[PDB]
Amino acid sequence: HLTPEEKSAVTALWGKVNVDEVGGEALGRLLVVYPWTQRFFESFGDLSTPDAVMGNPKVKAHGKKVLGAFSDGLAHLDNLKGTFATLSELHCDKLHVDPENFRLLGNVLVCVLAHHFGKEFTPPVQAAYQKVVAGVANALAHKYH
């Protein structure tokens, strides 16, 4: 449950997000900063160095897909559970992804937005995004069993 003014800080900032670029950037950083997360991307080609990870086209491609789904979710901030239920089931039953990874990606994304937007990524804007990324991860965790 985000407050109205937190909804509109989220909305305003996202209007400027190149979803493809940021997605590629955040997934790449995940895999660099928390390298055990590479366990899910065995088929992805070269992940041996930061530069290889960041320029990997499959990392970039998948990063666009992930953040695209995140993006869609920002239109349904009042029902993150219902919105992500099917991807939640997919991530549990087919992909076997420990939902803790959603939390780590949440925090990398926050760092990317801060790095990319600089001083515009104010402490109130950050706070609103923290609530978003916890909500998303929670919603993606929700159908695990």
Partner: protein, 141 residues
């Protein structure tokens, strides 16, 4: 972080585990999968049903690694070096899951060793599992 009194406490308590090691390991893992279902994401290859031979065998490997840790409590990084590599480079289990299994090992010992699980032994075992956990995640990055 492990004091001498911790080391006495752990050896005492875990010495009592003895030949139940296998069994207590299996029980901890089952407690873990039922209490914390996300942990199962690390075992989609296993028959995780109650009494499965895969879980009993794994239980015994975990217990024996703990016995090894206790028998070398002074030099845990070294004694667990291979296991460290395996979890860092291949298994790649998110570090939060070690807390979940530690807590389940603690519950198991509690339900099985009523004379030994005094508050001080409880604190010692908790520190011990946290220390083994830190060792097993030492080389993650």
């Amino acid at each position: 972080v492990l004091s001498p009194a911790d080391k006495t406490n752990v050896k005492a308590a875990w010495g009592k585990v003895g030949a139940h090691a296998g069994e207590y390991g299996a029980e901890a893992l089952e407690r873990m999968f039922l209490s914390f279902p996300t942990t199962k994401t690390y075992f989609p290859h296993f028959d995780l049903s109650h009494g499965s031979a895969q879980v009993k065998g794994h239980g015994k490997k975990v217990a024996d690694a703990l016995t090894n840790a206790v028998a070398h409590v002074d030099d845990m990084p070294n004694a667990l070096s291979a296991l460290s590599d395996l979890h860092a480079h291949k298994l790649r289990v998110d570090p939060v899951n070690f807390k979940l299994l530690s807590h389940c090992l603690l519950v198991t010992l509690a339900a099985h060793l009523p004379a030994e699980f005094t508050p001080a032994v409880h604190a010692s075992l908790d520190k011990f599992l946290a220390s083994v956990s830190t060792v097993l995640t030492s080389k993650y990055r």
